[PDB]
Write a protein that binds this ligand. Structure first.
Ligand SMILES: NC(=O)c1ccc[n+]([C@@H]2O[C@H](COP(=O)([O-])OP(=O)(O)OC[C@H]3O[C@@H](n4cnc5c(N)ncnc54)[C@H](O)[C@@H]3O)[C@@H](O)[C@H]2O)c1
Ligand SMILES: Cc1cc2nc3c(=O)[nH]c(=O)nc-3n(C[C@H](O)[C@H](O)[C@H](O)COP(=O)(O)O)c2cc1C
Ligand code: SF4
Ligand code: FES
Lengths: 417, 155
C-alpha cells in the first residue's frame, strides 16, 4: 500500500491511449483498471489463435519503442519458427539520459503493461515471462509485484488462464546500476544470475536467449501498445498518426522547456511542435541552441521541423527530447555525455573500454584548460575509434553525439583550442 | 557468520521466487545492502552457498554492479544524479546545499554513519531535474530550505 516517494512527472496526451490513466500521477489498481474495460483485450486474445495475434501486431506496423525500432510482429515471427519452451521479457531497464517514458506506465498503469505481457506471451507461446526493471526504480518494482498479485488473484495469471489452457507466470527482476543491462543479451545474462555482459549477435535472442531458448525481448512502451492493437483491431490502430509510422508514441521532454514531462502524440508531430506547441516553449523564451536525442543525437536549431518518427530524416531513437538554450555550453554538455559512456562501458571490447575512458578523460582536460595539443589531437582520434571490434550498440554510439556537436557547432569547440 | 532470521527468510524467499536459485543474486544483494547499510565482505560466502554458486562468481557480481558498496556503511544513501539534464538544471546547487547541511561532498559519509553521497548516472526523472534519491525515495531539488526539510525526515 505504501510505496517509496516518486516525483510527480507531468504527463499529457492528445490520443488518450497509453496515458488514458497514466496522465494522473498515481497507482491505478486492478478494480480501477477493470472499470475502464481493462483485461478485456486479454479475454478477446485468449479466444484467438496465437498466430492471429502475431499477424495483427505485424499488420498494425508496431515497431520497437526501445530505440532501435524493429518491427514487433516480425520479431515474434522469428522466435516462433524455433521450437519451445519460449521466454518473453519486458525490458524495463530505462537508463538512457533524458528517457523517463517507461516508468510512468509502470508506476501509474501497471495493469496496461501486465495485460500486454500476457497477450504477448500467449502469442509466442511463452509460459514464463520476465520484467527486468532497473534498480533505481524500487517503487516501480513494488508496484509491479503488487499488481501481478492482483492479476493472479483475478485469474489472469497462473495455470489455465480463464479456461484457455494457457499457463503464465511473470517474474520481476531488478538491475543494480548497470546501463548495459538494458542491452537485451546483457539483460538475459543478468537474468541468469551473471554479469551484464552482452553476447555476440547473431545469434539473436529469438533463436538463443534465456537458457539458450527462443526469447523475445520487448520494451515497456512497445508491450503497452499490444492491448490497444487487440481491442480496436489493427486497421483502426493504423488510423492513429501517419500510415507509415502509426500508433501512439510517448515523448519524454526535459531541459530548458516551460512544461517538462511525457507527451503522448502521433509520430507525424515535428520536434518544433513538441517544444513550442506542447512543452510550452523554452524557459525564459530563450532561443534553442540544440536538442539532444538522449545520449545518441544532437539536432541544431536548424533541424526542428523534422518528424518525430522512425524515418531516416526523422528524429528516431526513443523520442527523448533534451532541449538546450543559447547560454548552455555545448562542450560542457558533450563532457557529460562522454562521462556517461566512460561510466557505462562493460569493458569487454578493448577500443570501447579505452575509447570511452579516454574520450571523457581528454574532453575534461579540454574543458578545464589542462589540454595539450596532443590531448586535443588524441581526443579527436579516440572519438572516431570506439566502434572497432564492438559486439554491442554501446561502442557503436559512444562518440556519435559528440562527433555531431563538433560538426554542427565548430565555433564553441575552437574556443577551447 | 550467520544472517539473522529477519534477513535469512527474505533471502530464501527471493531464492525460491525464480525457477532457478542463481537468478536471485541481485535481489539477495539488494536485501543485504538494505539490512546492513552496505555489503559486508563476510556475507558473500553464506550467500554463495545459499545460491549454490562458487564464491568467485558472487564477488565478480558485487564488483560489476554499481548499486553495491562493500566499502562504507551508511543508514541513508543520498544518490545524486550527475548526468546531462541534472547538470544543466542545477546539480551543483544541490551538491552545494548538501555540503552546507551535512558537511560532506560526493563519495563521503557523515561522521555518525547516517548519510553518504553517491554520484550516480541519469535516474530517469529528467523532467524533475535536479534529481536525488534518499535510499528508495526520489525527489526534485528545489532549494536548500526544501532539501533541509526532506533530509530531516531521515532519523
Ligand atoms: N529506452 C531506453 O531506455 C534505451 C536506453 C538505451 C538505449 N536504448 C536504444 O537502444 C538502441 C540500440 O539497440 P540494439 O543494439 O538492441 O538494436 P538492434 O538494431 O541491433 O536490434 C533491435 C531489436 O531487433 C532484434 N533484431 C534485430 N535484427 C534481428 C534479426 N535479424 N533477427 C531477429 N531479431 C533481430 C533484436 O533482437 C532487438 O530486440 C538505440 O537506438 C537506443 O536508442 C534505449
Ligand atoms: C547499451 C544499450 C542499452 C539499452 N537499454 C535499453 C533500455 O533501457 N530499455 C529498452 O527497452 N531497450 C534498451 N536497449 C535496446 C535493447 O537491446 C532492445 O533492442 C529492446 O529492449 C528490444 O525491445 P523493442 O523491440 O520493443 O524496442 C538498449 C540497447 C543498448 C545497445
Ligand atoms: S561495445 Fe562496449 S559496452 Fe558493448 S559489449 Fe563491447 S565493451 Fe561492452
Ligand atoms: S539526467 Fe538526472 S534524472 Fe535524467
Amino acid at each position: 500500500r505504501s510505496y517509496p516517494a516518486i516525483p510527480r512527472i507531468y504527463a499529457e496526451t492528445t490520443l488518450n491511449m497509453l496515458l488514458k490513466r497514466a496522465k494522473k500521477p498515481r497507482v491505478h489498481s486492478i478494480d480501477e483498471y477493470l472499470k475502464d474495460g481493462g483485461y478485456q483485450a486479454l479475454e478477446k486474445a485468449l479466444n484467438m489463435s496465437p498466430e492471429e495475434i502475431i499477424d495483427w501486431v505485424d499488420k498494425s506496423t508496431l515497431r520497437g519503442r526501445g530505440g532501435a525500432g524493429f518491427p514487433t510482429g516480425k520479431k515474434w515471427k522469428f522466435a516462433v519458427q524455433n521450437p519451445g519452451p519460449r521466454y518473453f521479457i519486458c525490458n524495463a531497464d530505462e537508463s538512457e539520459p533524458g528517457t523517463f517514458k517507461d516508468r510512468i506506465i509502470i508506476e501509474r498503469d501497471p495493469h496496461l503493461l501486465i495485460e500486454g505481457i500476457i497477450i504477448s506471451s500467449y502469442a509466442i507461446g511463452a509460459n514464463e515471462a520476465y520484467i527486468y526493471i532497473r534498480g533505481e526504480y524500487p517503487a516501480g518494482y513494488y508496484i509491479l509485484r503488487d499488481a501481478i498479485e492482483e492479476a493472479k488473484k483475478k485469474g489472469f495469471l497462473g495455470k489455465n488462464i480463464l479456461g484457455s489452457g494457457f499457463d503464465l507466470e511473470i517474474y520481476v527482476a531488478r538491475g543494480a546500476g548497470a546501463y548495459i543491462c538494458g542491452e537485451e543479451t546483457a539483460l538475459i545474462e543478468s537474468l541468469e544470475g551473471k554479469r551484464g555482459h552482452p553476447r555476440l549477435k547473431p545469434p539473436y535472442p529469438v533463436q538463443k536467449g534465456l537458457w539458450g531458448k527462443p526469447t523475445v525481448v520487448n520494451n515497456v512502451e512497445t508491450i503497452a501498445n499490444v492491448p490497444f492493437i487487440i481491442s480496436m483491431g489493427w486497421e483502426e490502430y493504423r488510423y492513429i498518426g501517419p500510415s507509415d509510422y502509426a500508433g501512439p508514441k510517448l515523448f519524454p521532454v526535459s531541459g530548458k522547456v516551460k512544461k517538462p514531462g511525457v507527451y503522448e502524440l502521433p509520430m507525424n508531430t515535428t520536434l518544433r511542435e513538441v517544444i513550442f506547441k506542447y512543452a510550452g516553449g523554452t524557459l525564459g523564451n530563450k532561443k534553442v541552441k540544440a536538442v539532444f536525442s538522449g545520449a545518441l543525437d544532437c539536432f541544431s536549431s536548424e533541424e526542428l521541423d523534422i518528424p518525430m518518427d522512425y524515418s531516416p530524416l526523422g528524429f528516431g531513437g526513443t523520442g527523448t527530447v533534451i532541449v538546450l538554450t543559447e547560454e548552455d555550453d555545448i562542450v560542457e554538455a558533450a563532457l557529460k555525455i562522454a562521462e556517461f559512456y566512460e561510466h557505462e562501458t562493460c569493458g569487454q571490447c578493448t577500443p570501447c573500454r579505452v575509447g570511452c575512458y579516454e574520450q571523457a578523460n581528454l574532453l575534461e582536460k579540454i574543458y578545464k584548460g589542462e589540454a595539450t595539443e596532443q590531448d586535443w589531437e588524441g581526443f579527436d582520434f579516440v572519438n572516431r575509434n570506439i566502434q572497432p571490434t564492438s559486439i554491442c550498440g554501446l561502442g557503436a554510439v559512444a562518440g556519435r553525439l559528440i562527433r555531431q556537436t563538433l560538426e554542427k557547432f565548430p565555433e564553441e569547440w575552437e574556443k577551447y583550442r | 557468520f550467520e544472517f539473522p532470521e529477519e534477513l535469512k527468510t527474505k533471502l530464501q524467499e527471493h531464492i525460491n521466487y525464480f525457477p532457478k536459485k542463481r537468478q536471485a543474486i541481485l535481489l539477495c544483494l539488494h536485501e543485504i545492502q538494505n539490512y546492513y547499510g552496505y555489503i559486508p565482505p563476510e556475507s558473500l560466502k553464506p550467500l554463495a552457498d545459499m545460491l549454490e554458486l562458487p564464491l568467485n562468481h558472487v564477488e565478480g557480481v558485487v564488483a560489476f554492479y554499481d548499486m553495491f558498496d562493500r566499502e562504507d556503511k551508511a543508514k541513508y544513501r543520498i544518490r545524486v544524479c550527475v548526468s546531462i539534464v541534472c547538470h544543466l538544471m542545477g546539480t551543483n546547487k544541490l551538491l552545494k546545499a548538501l555540503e552546507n547541511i551535512l558537511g560532506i561532498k560526493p563519495g563521503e559519509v557523515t561522521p555518525d554513519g547516517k548519510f553518504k553521497i553517491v554520484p550516480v548516472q541519469c535516474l530517469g526523472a529528467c523532467s524533475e531535474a535536479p534529481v536525488f534519491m534518499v535510499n528508495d525515495d526520489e525527489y526534485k531539488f528545489e532549494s536548500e530550505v526544501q532539501l533541509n526539510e526532506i533530509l530531516s525526515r531521515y532519523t
